[PDB]
Amino acid sequence: SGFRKMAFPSGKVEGCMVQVTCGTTTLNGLWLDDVVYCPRHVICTSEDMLNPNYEDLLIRKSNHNFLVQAGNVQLRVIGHSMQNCVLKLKVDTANPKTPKYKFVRIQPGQTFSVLACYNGSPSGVYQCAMRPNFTIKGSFLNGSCGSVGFNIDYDCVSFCYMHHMELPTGVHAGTDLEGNFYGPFVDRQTAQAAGTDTTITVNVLAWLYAAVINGDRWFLNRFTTTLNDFNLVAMKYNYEPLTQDHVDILGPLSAQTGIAVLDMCASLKELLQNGMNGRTILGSALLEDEFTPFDVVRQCSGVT
Amino acid sequence: SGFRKMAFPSGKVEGCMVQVTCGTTTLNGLWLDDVVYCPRHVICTSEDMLNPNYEDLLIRKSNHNFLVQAGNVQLRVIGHSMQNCVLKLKVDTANPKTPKYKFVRIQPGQTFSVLACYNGSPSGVYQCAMRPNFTIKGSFLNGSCGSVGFNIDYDCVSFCYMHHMELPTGVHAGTDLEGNFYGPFVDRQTAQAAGTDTTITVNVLAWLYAAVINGDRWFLNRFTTTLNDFNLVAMKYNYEPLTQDHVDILGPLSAQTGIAVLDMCASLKELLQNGMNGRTILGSALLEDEFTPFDVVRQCSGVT
Ligand SMILES: *CC(=O)N1CCN(Cc2cccc3c(CCNC(C)=O)c[nH]c23)CC1
Ligand SMILES: *CC(=O)N1CCN(Cc2cccc3c(CCNC(C)=O)c[nH]c23)CC1
């Protein structure tokens, strides 16, 4: 027992990290097979960052301008191309440590692990959720760009994120591995509005189910509610409206604990309206929304 | 910017994990060079767990009874010995993936990453602190025993923990890599008192410094305090007394932010006496104590 914000083991991704340098700018790249993927802003200087014309900036660059170093060994760049906001540098050597992998575009509300890197070297790993507003609340300093987010299903790494920027608000924005940004963000140093964020209701309910499984039960009550009633409360407190799809995903946890999903909604309703009266749930003094129903089941069943 | 409970990249440790089976019991082992380290209770059945005589149980076992599997390859066991609460199985093959490593006994209040494993397969990674009462609040299910805790300094892994047990209270106990338990715990299925836990004061102050660096400043006040005064409040709220050694360790963060350590103590004093009035600090609604001053500096400076 016990419940922690657990990230996937990062080994398979550490073996893919490389340093990409173009001119004076250095960031991280992801080496899979004979291709290195990195943010296209590796070709900018601070002089260009306010309003870059990426097509024009990339035209002044040749394969020999992209310096790719895997730890201490230099990769020979034999092709370069821009796809959306990523650069794909074809190298002459396939990464011997390339795991089985997929490129996936995750949905808002889903979670993933991030391997923060600096100069191609992994520094740490943590679990994130893609916010409903398509930002992530990460931990990224200058040089962390090109660090990736991923999920691991047995032997397969599904890469879902590459870090590109920090908003003036301190939240993070990035792309899928095809270079398409999550959200309305553009890779330009400009004021950018992150939309109104909401709390991921299905994840809070999943975490309440994890709390019951792990012993924390004080919040369970004698009440029930309806999806309509619950959603009136969800709206007042800026929670995502709960749908039957969310109830269906919570089915396994509802079955394991014997607590009907709408009964758990009534516990959540009372916690929203009354607060936690100074108590904690799974060591937290707030309602946690960064565990999906899949994460809770995995952490409570023991999947490797 | 941004602040997260970040664990070390687990790659170097994933390459050391093996499955150890003895009779019907399976747990995890750590393969470093030609030795596999695992909890000695791998030789028990539930029939033995209430009051085992480990010396007698180990005498009924031969090298061929210890089945060690590294992923899909079987290791040949050529020696076995018990050191405190660990077994050391000498194998005929040195682990090709053995990183540079040390065995260290961490101090209470220090942090480390845990790579939770099942059947020799890594499932996830999270950051822990060794509680002042020598327990850890982890996430471990049956079969997780033998999972290890560690720190990573550039290329060197310092193994500090091996998981052995869950107390009836749900907290976790284990040993250093010489098999010596942290705390008064014994590897026997019996009622065991974890001492009174305290909050790691120097870590809460370190996390308040991380909050200031990352923008969360609402808690800073116009007050100061003394070590004596602060410690009267620390005692009332079950915080560890602050010493000059703790002030000295906070020196770098005090210098970086320009907030004198005793001024930060006065902010902490007011948070303890007044609570957080429904506000948050670094996304938390409670005072976080699982970041050391070293962790905060590493996460805020970018060390890989
Ligand atoms: C992650 C990293 O290493 N960074 C250093 C280079 N920075 C360049 C860059 C790229 C795209 C968008 C940028 C913005 C958006 C506005 N943000 C702020 C804080 O003003 C700023 N710099 C950008 C990315 C970060
Ligand atoms: C971690 C793991 O895989 N476990 C399964 C085997 N268990 C055996 C064991 C070893 C040492 C001490 C034990 C206790 C102490 C009392 N705890 C409770 C909850 O009653 C129980 N089982 C023990 C360890 C866990």
Please provide residue B39's backbone torsions phi and psi, each rounded to the nearest 5 degrees: -65, 140
Alpha helices per DSSP H over chain B: 11-14, 54-59, 201-213, 227-236, 244-249, 251-257, 261-274, 293-301
Q: CA–CA separation, A65 vs A79, rounded Å?
A: 11
| Residues B113 and B7 sit within 8 Å (Cβ to Cβ) | yes
Query: What is the number of alpha carbons within 13 Å of residue B277 lying toward its C-beta?
Result: 6
Nearest to A303 by CA among A159, A131, A151, A200: A151
Q: Which of the residues A22, A41, A128, A163 is marked catalytic?
A: A41
Helices A201-213 and A261-274, axial angle in degrees (round to 10) = 100
SS3 A129: strand
Q: What is A183-234 written as a DSSP string?
A: SS--SSSS--------B-HHHHHHHHHHHHHTT--TT--S----HHHHHHHH
Q: Would you say A147 and A28 are in contact if contact means Cβ atoms under 8 Å apart?
A: yes
The closest of B304, B33, B112 to A17, measured between CA atoms, is: B304
CA-based nearest residue to A136, from A49, A197, A202 = A197
Given the structure tokens 């320009």, which residue do they identify? B258
Tokens matching residue A300: 């409570």
AA letter at A269: K
A96 at interface of B, judged by CB pairs closer than 8 A: no
Cα of A164 vs centre of ligand 1, distance in Å, is 7
Distance between CA atoms of residues B283 and A51, nearest Å:
33
End-to-end CA distance of chain B: 16
For chain B, the helix, strand and coil percentages under 3-state DSSP, each to the nearest 5: 25, 30, 45
Give just the sign of the alpha carbon dihedral B266, A283, A281, A203: positive
Is the CB of A145 inside a 6 Å radius of any atom of ligand 1?
Answer: yes
What are the backbone angles phi and psi of residue B68, rounded to the nearest 5°? -115, 120
CA–CA separation, A19 and A69 (whole Å): 5
Given its phi and psi angles, is residue A258 left (phi above 0), alpha (psi -120 to 50 degrees) or beta? left
CATH fold match for the domains A1-14+100-197 and A15-99: yes
Which ligand is closest in space to the CA of residue A168? Answer: 1
Per the CB < 8 A criterion, the answer to whether B83 and B178 are in contact is: yes
CB A106 within 8 Å of CB A294: no
How deeply is A40 buried, as exposed, middle or buried, from its count of CB atoms within 10 A (0-12, 13-18, 19+)?
A: buried
From A166, A172, A188, A190, the mutation candidate for ligand 1 (largest count of ligand atoms within 8 A of CB) is A166
Q: How far is residue B290's CA from residue B275's CA, in Å, rounded to a whole number?
A: 19
**Partners of residue B276 in chain A, C-beta under 8 Å:** 285
**Comparing C-alpha atoms, which of A17, A4, A241 is closest to residue A127?**
A4
Of B6, B283, B215, B301, which is closest to residue A169 (Cα–Cα)?
B215
A126 touches chain B (CB under 8 A): yes
Q: How far apart are CA B203 and CA B208, in angstroms?
A: 9
Q: Is B189 in the pocket of ligand 2 (CB under 6 A)?
A: yes
Annotated resolution, angstroms? 1.6
Best of B44, B166, B186 to mutate for ligand 2, by most ligand atoms within 8 A of CB?
B166
The Cα B10–Cα B14 span in angstroms is 6
Q: How far is CA B222 from CA A66, A244, B113, B124, in A?
A: 52, 52, 37, 43
* Residues B141 and B118 sit within 8 Å (Cβ to Cβ): yes
Architecture of domain B1-14+100-197: Beta Barrel (2.40)
Separation CA A17–CA A15 (nearest Å) = 6
Tokens 């023991």 map to which residue? A302
- Name the one residue in this structure whose structure tokens are 């720190």: B151
As given in the structure block, the two tokens for residue B231 are 């410690």
3-state secondary structure of B274: helix
Token pair 């992801």 in the structure block, residue: A30
Q: Are A132 and A240 in contact (CB under 8 A)?
A: yes
User: Which residues 6+ apart lie within 8 Å of A251 measured at CB?
Assistant: A261
* Residue B136: closest C-alpha in chain A: A2
Of the candidates B16, B22, B38, B41, the residue annotated as catalytic is: B41
**Ligand 1 atom 17 nearest Cα:** A167
B2, B124, B278: residue with CB nearest A7: B124
Q: What angle do CA B37, A10, A303 make, to 5 degrees?
A: 70
Cβ of B284 under 8 Å from any chain A Cβ?
yes
Residue to probe by mutation, ligand 2, list B171, B189, B192, most atoms within 8 Å of CB = B189
User: Tokens in use for A215?
Assistant: 């012993």
The question of whether A41 is a catalytic residue gets the answer yes
**CA–CA dist A203, A292 (Å, integer):** 5
DSSP H or E stretch at residue A252: helix A251-257
Crossing angle (nearest 10°) for helices B201-213 and B261-274: 100
Contacts 24+ apart (CB under 8 A), B96-100: B97/B15, B97/B16, B98/B15, B98/B16, B98/B31, B98/B32, B98/B33, B99/B12, B99/B13, B99/B15, B99/B16, B99/B155, B99/B156, B99/B157, B100/B155, B100/B156, B100/B157
Angle between helices B261-274 and B227-236 (to 10 degrees): 30
The Cα B271–Cα B266 span in angstroms is 9
**Other residues' Cβ atoms within 10 Å of the Cβ of residue A37:** 26
- Based on its alpha-carbon atoms, the radius of gyration of chain A, rounded to whole angstroms, reads 21
User: How far is residue B55 from each of residues A103, B61, B86, B87, measured CA to CA in Å?
Assistant: 52, 10, 12, 11
Closest CA to A76 of A85, A89, A57, A61: A89
In DSSP terms, A69 is beta-bridged to: A19, A74
- CB contact under 8 Å between A6 and B139, yes or no, is yes
Note if A172 is an active site residue.
no
Q: According to CATH, what is the number of the domain A15-99?
A: 2.40.10.10
What is the C-alpha to C-alpha distance for residues B250 and A84, in angstroms, rounded to an integer? 45
Query: Which structural technique was applied?
Result: X-ray
DSSP secondary structure, A93-119, as one string: S--TT--EEEE--PPTT-EEEEEEEET
A12 with A99: CB under 8 angstroms? Answer: yes
Residue whose tokens read 């039957």: A244
- Select from 1.20.1440.230, 1.20.1730.10, 1.10.1840.10, 2.60.40.10 the CATH code of B198-301: 1.10.1840.10
Q: H helices of B84-242, where?
A: 201-213, 227-236
**DSSP run (H or E) holding A54:** helix A54-59
Atom 15 of ligand 1, residue of closest alpha carbon: A189
Which pair of structure tokens corresponds to residue A273?
């309206």
Q: In whole angstroms, what is the distance from residue B168 CA to residue B190 CA?
A: 9
CA separation for the pair A145, A173 (Å, rounded): 10
CA–chain centroid gap for A237, Å, is: 24
B165 Cβ inside 6 Å of ligand 2: yes
Tokens of A130: 């893609």
Distance from the Cα of residue B101 to its chain's centroid: 17
**Residues B193, B210: Cα–Cα separation, whole Å:** 34
Q: Is the CB of B274 under 6 A from ligand 2?
A: no
- Chain A window 143-172: which residues touch B at a Cβ cutoff of 8 Å? 143-144, 166, 170-172
Are the C-beta atoms of residues B122 and B113 closer than 8 Å to each other? no
Residue pair A164/A85 in contact (Cβ under 8 Å)? The answer is yes
> Which of the 8 DSSP states describes residue A241?
P
CA distance B83 to chain A (A): 28
Is the Cα dihedral A113, A117, A121, A124 positive or negative? Answer: negative
Are the C-beta atoms of A120 and A67 separated by less than 8 Å? Answer: no
Q: How far is the CA of A140 from the centre of ligand 1 (A)?
A: 11
Calpha distance B11→A81 (Å, rounded): 31
Helix (H) or strand (E) holding A123: strand A121-129
Of B5, B8, B122, Cβ closest to residue A304: B122
Task: Tell me how far apart the alpha carbons of residues A96 and A93 are, in angstroms, rounded to a whole number.
Answer: 8
Contacting residues of B for A284, CB less than 8 Å apart: 284-286
Q: Which atom number of ligand 2 is nearest to the Cα of residue B44?
A: 8
Task: Bin B269: left if φ > 0, else alpha if -120 < ψ < 50, else beta.
Answer: alpha
Residue A125 to residue B214, Cβ atoms within 8 A: no
Element spanning A253, H or E: helix A251-257
Element counts in chain B: helices (H) and strands (E): 8, 13
Structural contact between residues B19 and B69, judged by C-beta atoms closer than 8 angstroms: yes
Structure tokens of B232? 């009267």
Position of tokens 């120097």? Answer: B202
B39, β-bridge pairs: B86
Compute φ and ψ for B137, nearest 5 degrees.
Answer: -100, 85
**Judging by beta carbons within 10 Å of its beta carbon (0-12, 13-18, 19+), is residue B226 exposed, middle or buried?**
exposed
**Measured from the CB, is residue A194 less than 6 Å from ligand 1?**
no
The alpha carbon of A10 and the centre of ligand 2 are apart by a number of angstroms equal to 28
Residue with tokens 């009035």: B277
Element spanning A294, H or E: helix A293-301
Nearest to B165 by CA among B145, B179, B195: B145
Question: How far apart are the C-alpha atoms of B117 and B113, rounded to whole Å?
Answer: 13
| CA B238 remoteness from chain centre | 21
Q: Which residues pair with A126 in a beta bridge?
A: A114
Domain definitions of chain A by residue range: 1-14+100-197, 15-99, 198-301
Residues 10 through 49 of chain B touching chain A, CB cutoff 8 Å = 10-11, 14-15
| B256/A contact by beta carbon, under 8 A | no
DSSP state letters, A4-53: --PBPP-HHHHTTEEEEEETTEEEEEEEETTEEEEEGGGG--TTTTTS--
Q: Which ligand is nearest to the CA of B51?
A: 2
From B303, which residue of chain A is nearest by alpha-carbon distance?
A: A123
Which residues on adjacent β-strands are paired with residue A26? Answer: A21
> CA quadruple A210, A212, A217, A222: dihedral positive or negative?
positive
What backbone phi and psi angles, to 5 degrees, belong to B127? -95, 135
Q: Positive or negative CA dihedral for B54, B59, B61, B66?
A: positive
- Given a contact cutoff of 8 angstroms between Cβ atoms, the answer to whether A19 and A31 are in contact is no
